[PDB]
Design a protein that fits this description.
The structure is cut from a larger assembly and holds two copies of chain A (420 residues), one copy of chain B (81 residues) and one copy of chain C (60 residues). Chain B has 81 residues and is mainly α. Helix content of chain B is 65%, strand content 0%. Chain B is elongated. The B-D interface holds B 63-64, 67, 70-72, 74-75, 77-78 and D 304, 307, 310-311, 314, 322, 325-326, 328-329. Chain C: It comes from Homo sapiens.
């Protein structure tokens, strides 16, 4: 149906601004949202359609300690939207309490936008894990929606914070955030800072403004994942039809992504498939096996090569996945995009559930457990002191992520016939 | 529907019964004891008959023509009668 | 153009049409369209293309 | 034909002053009533036409304890009218007796204005229920006209007093007033303070000068209900043609209203219809079913959508009305108004007979009956003591409103085939 976008936090509002500029340049519209005559499309999912065809986006903007939100405010794309929804620490409990006191009027903003929609499919939020102001607040509003609406979906695109370890309560905050993510969300798409750092240092030579190019890559991914919605396809034009195959189980619902060019400034279906089989073309860093993989391709493809390719892909066994049961790769095609120069013609996007990401969770678990053994790294800030006097929510989150990692490590096994 | 004899052949009674009714009710501002009830019953049964007949004839086929039928039939008063 | 619309919008748009059927009358399908199984489908076919495309093809 | 307006009481003269300023700004005339050259219309119903085209309104002004009537007196719109008709407690019996002694010369004012008209269609009065000076007096003049002229109509626009309960005889006064309203009037349009309070608190953030904005909304409603008269339409340009369909029965003649924008600072016929189906766009607060609904639309409408809309309106069954018989909604179109900025292009007005308003009457009945059981709330004022020594008119009004509520609750039933 219709999908409502949400954005909060400094990194989330940055990537949302980049996503809307991406879809502004991508389709034939003005930076005030007037349709271009020279351009057909559906933009009714993420944009409300007006009478002069002002495709005003379904983007609710929440801010706390605004500095870059002011730069979003005075912009030549500030005529695209004005839904009148902008409403004003670096701790999880701080952002949790700040969202707690204003939950009513932001819920009025939610219900107003819900009344703006006739039907609904899902909520996306722009969020970053352990982002400071975003952390805790995002978990709180996730709790609010999960309490309010069991009839809809939530998709979440968020990055894993790694700054190569002043902030030492960051593993605690990310742990509590991911606890709410496993239990109160239905599907998670997670990425790494380090893998995008690798691809950025390979494709280019920039080190300091890396955030900006990260925003570009996030925008390309978020357009790619939505192309079968925005350009009219004929299958999985609901989100739940896309999500249904990849997630059999309500705790292992974390999805990793890839995209075939590292630098984007013929390719055949065989080439782009085997490139997409690499972890260096995947933007997330015993043998680990996928449960299921999905691929969507967009470009100038020849339809007869593709059956040749998946024949030979069976034959070489260039993937190694065996959960326990008959769940394999799903390949799909979307339109090569007009209204932009189509260079690097064929490009693919890849979506899988793989057990290896548990190791990265385990790395964070190893850090948090170490700090939990010392118990000197909450720094006795008053916010976490009010919200839990005994700090037992950290132990509850520890036992939940223990269940999660154990479910992961059992999910590797070909005896996962039971407990799936 | 001047060219169409059955719907016309229904509607002429619809105009004539109101010709009688409008003159009859103005005579008394109290109860009509001058055989008012007998004629009133004859009128209402006749209107039920002719209304069902004209609904059958009507069911050319313009969106407005089809669209007026459901205003009466949002009651199922003539979706059953 | 008419053949393209035929083989495109069925053989998407019909997704929304069929989702309501999960939750029957002969007039409800009409107003959904103009916005164990077996449905009734008819649409306006114009004459100069009605003579080039056979009647029996539409049944297949 | 021609319609004579009446105004009395503080709230009534306030809303009449606002209505005349509304029609002053709305049509192309001066605040002394000189036609503007830059402006065609009929203003012959509510204004007498002069030789320099001074459209002097048919507004008879009666005052008692004038404070705001003085502010009406010195005004730049005091050159629009001067029919020389201004002639001088907070009780029903007080205003009744004060109108009783001066009934002759105000009846001379009535007959003078009647001679000013060649033909006549109806009398409107500006009145507020339990307004103090207006209450009782308005019932008395209603009795005078109902005695005098059975050949005309009376339309009444009056509000239901709710101040969220010093004045405790207010339910008695409103009860006696509504008794005269059911038996001596032909059609009543009633509104709530609380529903306008909801719409005002939603559209704006004002709480204290709420009367002023209430006046604006009343003026917009009273212009809307009269637009097919003032702008030349071709059906129901008599009042009785409008009133005839909504009222089958002489006691259930109470009409409730709605209007599509809450804030007025495309819309399609489907959107404005379903908005008008809400009770939050209606300015009045078992299952209840309408007897009949009427809608008039004014804006930039496309004529082919409207039959599509009422098809689908049958199909979704987004209204629930079944009195017992074949009385349904009536949709109509009037001109989108020139000579003012036409923003919020399409706007609708809604007129129905619905049984739910009986509950609100019942609320007042519950209050009055409680006070009648205690019998300490007339406060023994001398006016009600002279007018009825035994206070049996209250019991007669109680039995009449009992008949009214019973007629309402039977009118809900699909066995209302008899006693209709």
């Amino acid at each position: 149906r219709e999908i409502i976008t949400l954005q909060l936090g400094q990194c989330g509002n940055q990537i949302g601004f980049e996503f809307w500029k991406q879809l502004c340049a991508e389709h034939g519209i003005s930076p005030e949202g007037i349709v271009e005559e020279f351009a057909t499309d559906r933009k009714d999912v993420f944009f409300y359609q007006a009478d002069d065809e002002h495709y005003i986006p379904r983007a609710v903007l929440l801010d706390l300690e605004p500095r870059v939100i002011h730069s979003i405010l005075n912009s030549p794309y500030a005529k695209l939207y004005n839904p009148e929804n902008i409403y004003l620490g670096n701790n999880w409990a701080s952002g949790f309490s700040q969202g707690e006191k204003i939950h009513e009027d932001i819920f009025d903003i939610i219900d107003r936008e819900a009344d703006g929609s006739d039907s609904l499919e899902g909520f996306v939020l722009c969020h970053s894990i352990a982002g400071g102001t975003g952390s805790g607040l995002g978990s709180y509003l996730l709790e609010r929606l999960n309490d309010r609406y069991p009839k809809k979906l939530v998709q979440t695109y968020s990055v894993f914070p790694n700054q190569d370890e002043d902030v030492v309560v960051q593993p605690y905050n990310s742990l509590l955030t991911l606890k709410r993510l496993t239990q109160n969300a239905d599907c998670v798409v997670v990425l790494d800072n380090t893998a995008l750092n690798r691809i950025a240092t390979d494709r280019l030579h920039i080190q300091n403004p890396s955030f900006s190019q990260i925003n570009q890559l996030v925008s390309t991914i978020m357009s790619a994942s939505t192309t079968t919605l925005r350009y009219p396809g004929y299958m999985n034009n609901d989100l739940i039809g896309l999500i249904a195959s990849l997630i059999p189980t309500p705790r292992l619902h974390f999805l990793m992504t890839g995209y075939t060019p590292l630098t984007t400034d013929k390719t055949t279906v065989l080439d782009v498939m085997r490139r997409l089989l690499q972890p260096k073309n995947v933007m997330v860093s015993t043998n680990h096996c996928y449960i299921a993989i999905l691929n969507i391709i967009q470009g100038e493809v020849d339809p007869t090569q593709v059956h040749k390719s998946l024949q030979r892909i069976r034959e070489r066994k260039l993937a190694n996945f065996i959960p326990w049961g008959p769940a394999s790769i799903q390949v799909a095609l979307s339109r090569k995009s007009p209204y932009l120069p189509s260079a690097h013609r064929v490009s693919g996007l890849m979506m899988a559930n793989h057990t290896s990401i548990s190791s990265l969770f385990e790395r964070t678990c190893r850090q948090y457990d170490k700090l939990r053994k010392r118990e000197a790294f909450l720094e006795q800030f008053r916010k976490e002191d009010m919200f839990k006097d005994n700090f037992d929510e950290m132990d509850t989150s520890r036992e939940i992520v223990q269940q999660l990692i154990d479910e992961y490590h059992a999910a590797t096994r070909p005896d996962y016939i039971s407990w799936g | 529907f001047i060219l169409l004899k059955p719907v016309f052949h229904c509607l002429n009674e619809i105009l004539d019964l109101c010709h009688s009714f409008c003159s009859l009710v103005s005579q008394n501002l109290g109860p009509l004891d001058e055989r008012g009830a007998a004629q009133l019953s004859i009128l209402v049964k006749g209107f039920s008959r002719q209304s069902s007949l004209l609904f059958k004839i009507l069911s050319h086929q313009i969106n407005s023509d089809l669209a007026q039928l459901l205003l009466r039939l949002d009651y199922n008063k003539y979706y059953t009668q | 153009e008419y053949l393209q619309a035929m083989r495109n919008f069925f053989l998407d748009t019909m997704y929304d049409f069929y989702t309501s059927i999960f939750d029957q009358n002969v007039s409800f399908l009409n107003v959904q369209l103009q916005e164990l199984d077996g449905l009734t489908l008819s649409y306006k076919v114009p004459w100069p293309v009605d003579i080039v495309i056979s009647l029996e093809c539409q049944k297949i």
